[PDB]
């Protein structure tokens, strides 16, 4: 169980470092894949980029059991499937007590390597392509709130 990261941390605006090859398959990315696991679950998340916990890796897991299967992706690249975008709710483990609108591709492309470096491409829609997105802009230091561009549904949960 390892501390999330808080908006305001300079860590969270870095571009995050890929996953070196020699450490696929390895204990060590097995046990920060585990404290990931942990820590993500433990406060109640659907996914947590390895940046919020102050580790620089492009390195992301997700999962809900609009269920979205348990993934842990290394080194993503993400190509749009088409123009079409689309709005929905958003909240962030480093941004507490807060959720926002934002607008994001409706159907994605995603690429990348599980943790033995196994390839991984899925195409994907609605709400498993936003969280995708979501968390790969961790890796490139943005947080939801940079996204935003109807400032009118941003706001405190409990308010809204
Ligand atoms: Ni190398
Ligand atoms: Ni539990
Ligand atoms: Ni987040």
Same mark, same amino acid.
Do not use: A
């Given at each position: 169980i390892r501390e999330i990261l808080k908006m305001? $941390?300079?860590?969270?605006l870095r571009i995050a470092q890929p996953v070196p090859s020699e450490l696929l398959g390895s204990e060590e990315l097995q046990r920060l894949i585990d404290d990931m696991f942990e820590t993500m679950h433990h406060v109640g998340g659907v996914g947590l980029a390895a940046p919020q916990i102050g580790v620089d890796l492009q390195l992301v897991i997700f999962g809900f059991e609009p269920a979205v299967p348990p993934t842990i992706l290394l080194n993503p690249r993400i190509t749009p499937l088409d123009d079409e975008m689309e709005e929905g709710w958003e909240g962030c483990l480093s941004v507490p007590g807060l959720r926002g609108a934002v607008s994001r591709h409706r159907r994605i492309r995603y690429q990348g390597l599980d943790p033995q470096g196994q390839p991984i491409d899925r195409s994907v829609e609605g709400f498993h392509a936003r969280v995708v997105q979501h968390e790969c802009d961790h890796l490139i230091g943005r947080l939801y709130p940079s996204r935003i561009? $109807? @400032?009118?549904? @941003?706001?405190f949960t409990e308010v809204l």
């Open positions: 305001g $941390d300079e860590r969270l561009t $109807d @400032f009118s549904k @941003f706001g």
